[PDB]
Amino acid sequence: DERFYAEHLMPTLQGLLDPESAHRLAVRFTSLGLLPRQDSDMLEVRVLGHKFRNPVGIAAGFDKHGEAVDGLYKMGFGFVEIGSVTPKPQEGNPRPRVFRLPEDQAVINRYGFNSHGLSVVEHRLRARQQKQAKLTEDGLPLGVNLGKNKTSVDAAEDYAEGVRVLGPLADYLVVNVSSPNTAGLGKAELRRLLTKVLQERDGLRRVHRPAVLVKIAPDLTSQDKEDIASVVKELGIDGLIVTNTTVSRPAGLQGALRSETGGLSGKPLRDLSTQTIREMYALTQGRVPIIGVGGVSSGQDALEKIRAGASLVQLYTALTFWGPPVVGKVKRELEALLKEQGFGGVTDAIGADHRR
Numbered sequence: 001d002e003r004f005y006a007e008h009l010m011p012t013l014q015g016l017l018d019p020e021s022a023h024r025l026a027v028r029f030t031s032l033g034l035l036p037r038q039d040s041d042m043l044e045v046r047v048l049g050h051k052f053r054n055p056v057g058i059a060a061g062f063d064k065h066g067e068a069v070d071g072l073y074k075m076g077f078g079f080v081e082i083g084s085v086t087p088k089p090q091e092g093n094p095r096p097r098v099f100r101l102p103e104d105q106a107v108i109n110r111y112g113f114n115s116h117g118l119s120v121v122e123h124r125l126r127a128r129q130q131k132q133a134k135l136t137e138d139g140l141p142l143g144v145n146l147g148k149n150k151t152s153v154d155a156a157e158d159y160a161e162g163v164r165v166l167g168p169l170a171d172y173l174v175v176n177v178s179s180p181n182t183a184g185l186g187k188a189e190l191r192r193l194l195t196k197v198l199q200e201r202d203g204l205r206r207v208h209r210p211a212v213l214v215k216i217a218p219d220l221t222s223q224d225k226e227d228i229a230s231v232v233k234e235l236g237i238d239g240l241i242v243t244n245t246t247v248s249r250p251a252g253l254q255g256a257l258r259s260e261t262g263g264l265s266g267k268p269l270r271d272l273s274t275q276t277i278r279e280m281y282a283l284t285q286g287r288v289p290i291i292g293v294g295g296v297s298s299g300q301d302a303l304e305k306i307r308a309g310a311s312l313v314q315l316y317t318a319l320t321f322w323g324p325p326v327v328g329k330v331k332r333e334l335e336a337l338l339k340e341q342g343f344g345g346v347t348d349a350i351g352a353d354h355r356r
């Protein structure tokens, strides 16, 4: 299957369908379990004391509305992140709003937080809440990424609503700094927002109390990164997700659509994300777990992020080019590399470039 998807089926499908139509179909195929279905003990990771069967997750934006979670576990992901979910439903930007850059192994998107909204997602997750508890117990956690509505004037209150409504259904919640596709996205205001989010989380009953992570852009200044690291440590934010898509356009992009507005993902992002992880790990003294994301398509890509300071990784864009078999490929390849490089497991490699 790995070669067949990569060389034949996915290229052919790219030809037939626009990428958004393809995404919609993929979410329906995955929700139906139209996939084949052990991970090595080497791949197990405990992050904040909680088990992950393997360190490879699906990034936010694939299953925006929580429709395909079980199918994603079936695909081999060690954890699933849904969202972003906004408090009220919203349509997002006009179509077309997703663009392939095949020559670059990249995508540009400007979805604009299209979302079924908190209530719909809440009911979807409730339908399977106990099943998720068992999965989480078995090493397959669920994350929920929270957004804000386009027309909201109080961003903190949108995020607070999301904590209250979906927090009780989540292992972890994510607050983005960092969508490029919502207008408006100092350190005192960042602190204010996060304090409110944490206070809401802290108010949930313990069985229903998620971790809270902040997801950042690759496009931050050095000052912004220092400031985030400082706030995260001061408030005791649980983790970081590093990174979202980039609004930069690195030199050398070849795709005809390179100058479309949106966030760029895939291969062109990869090393910018890895370098962001490396910086955030250093700034937080290795004490804050990082989920590393951006341009992971192989075991080497994953290990590079882990060795830079990621405890876990996610991928999305690689699926669009390689299909579902990429998940197994990344995990087999990572296991092989860890052995070659002398690591006992994933855990031993975390932050190794820094010297621990």
Ligand SMILES: Cc1cc(Oc2ccccc2)c(C(C)C)cc1-c1cc(C(=O)O)c2cc(F)ccc2n1
Residues within 6 Å of the ligand: 013, 014, 018, 019, 020, 022, 023, 025, 026, 027, 029, 030, 034, 035, 098, 100, 107, 319, 320, 323, 324
């Ligand atoms: C990731 C993916 C997998 C797919 O195939 C399967 C999905 C589930 C089960 C079996 C096959 C298919 C099919 C059904 C055409 C499409 C995709 C897919 C493709 C594309 C694409 O660019 O063609 C895509 C683009 C996005 F921006 C976001 C998600 C996307 N997902």
Ligand SMILES: Cc1cc2nc3c(=O)[nH]c(=O)nc-3n(C[C@H](O)[C@H](O)[C@H](O)COP(=O)(O)O)c2cc1C
Residues within 6 Å of the ligand: 059, 060, 061, 062, 064, 083, 084, 098, 107, 109, 111, 113, 145, 176, 215, 243, 244, 245, 264, 265, 266, 267, 269, 293, 294, 295, 296, 314, 315, 316, 317, 318
């Ligand atoms: C089509 C698409 C939609 C996305 N939507 C979201 C989103 O809703 N929330 C979010 O936090 N990140 C979103 N992302 C960003 C991804 O979660 C991820 O951070 C980024 O694409 C880099 O990983 P990748 O290079 O493996 O795709 C989206 C990415 C893509 C490609």
Ligand SMILES: CCCCCCCCCC[N+](C)(C)CCCS(=O)(=O)[O-]
Residues within 6 Å of the ligand: 047, 048, 050, 141, 170, 171, 172, 206, 207, 208, 209, 210, 211, 213, 238, 239, 289
């Ligand atoms: C930081 C990277 C993600 C770390 C994953 C943390 C998962 C934690 C939440 C689990 N649930 C069940 C929601 C609450 C248990 C609270 S506890 O019992 O005090 O551990």
Ligand SMILES: O=C(O)c1cc(=O)[nH]c(=O)[nH]1
Residues within 6 Å of the ligand: 061, 084, 109, 110, 111, 112, 113, 114, 176, 178, 179, 180, 181, 244, 245, 263
């Ligand atoms: O447009 C979106 O919905 C979206 C795109 C993206 O790249 N990142 C994100 O956080 N949201």
